[PDB]
């Protein structure tokens, strides 16, 4: 139920977004976590095959984001470069 | 025929894909609209049963997307409320 996704920043867009977070509009009802919210079919995330929309983001390059605010997590993700390592949690 | 479909984001998100949009290679000839292109076998859209691949997306939570760019429709679907109201058109 836990998966790591590794994404290299390149010429090709990463093709995903995250939503949610403490103090933000929940991405899903009753859960303030950070989740993968979209995946573009021509981006790195889709090409990697390791990310799925709705996956909960637990950490970004080793940094726990299970209680992060949205903007803090977005700031962490843009400072995760050239490589992004995500720890993901997925339901059945 | 026009149908309203209502979906709450869950473990697979909304659980479908959209294709098309103004300025993009069209999903259907000469028609740059937003269409439901896939439905995941798990997830909210699949459990609801109210979406069909090939459905034209006319509006998302009241916002007309008949002439929208793809990223605008993606934002409507993922950056607003977790509950999504879709107006869909079928041939």
């Amino acid at each position: 139920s836990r998966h790591v996704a590794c994404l290299a920043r390149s010429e090709r867009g990463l093709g995903f977004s995250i939503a949610g977070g403490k103090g933000s509009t929940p991405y899903r009802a009753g859960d303030a976590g950070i989740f993968v919210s979209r995946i573009a079919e021509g981006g790195a995330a889709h090409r990697a095959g390791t990310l799925q929309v709705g996956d909960r983001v637990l950490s970004i390059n080793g940094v726990d984001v299970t209680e992060a605010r949205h903007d803090h997590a977005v700031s962490l993700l843009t400072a995760a470069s050239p490589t992004i390592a995500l720890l993901l949690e997925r339901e059945a | 025929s026009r149908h309203v479909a209502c979906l709450a984001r869950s473990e697979r998100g909304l659980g479908f894909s959209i294709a098309g949009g103004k300025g993009s290679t069209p999903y259907r000839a000469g028609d740059a609209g937003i269409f439901v292109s896939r439905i995941a076998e798990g997830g909210a859209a699949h459990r609801a049963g109210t979406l069909q691949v090939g459905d034209r997306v006319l509006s998302i939570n009241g916002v007309d997307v008949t002439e929208a760019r793809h990223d605008h429709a993606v934002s409507l679907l993922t950056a607003a409320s977790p509950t999504i109201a879709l107006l869909l058109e079928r041939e």
Partner: peptide, 8 residues
Amino acid sequence: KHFRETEV
């Protein structure tokens, strides 16, 4: 122009 498809 590019074909755009996105999972949501």
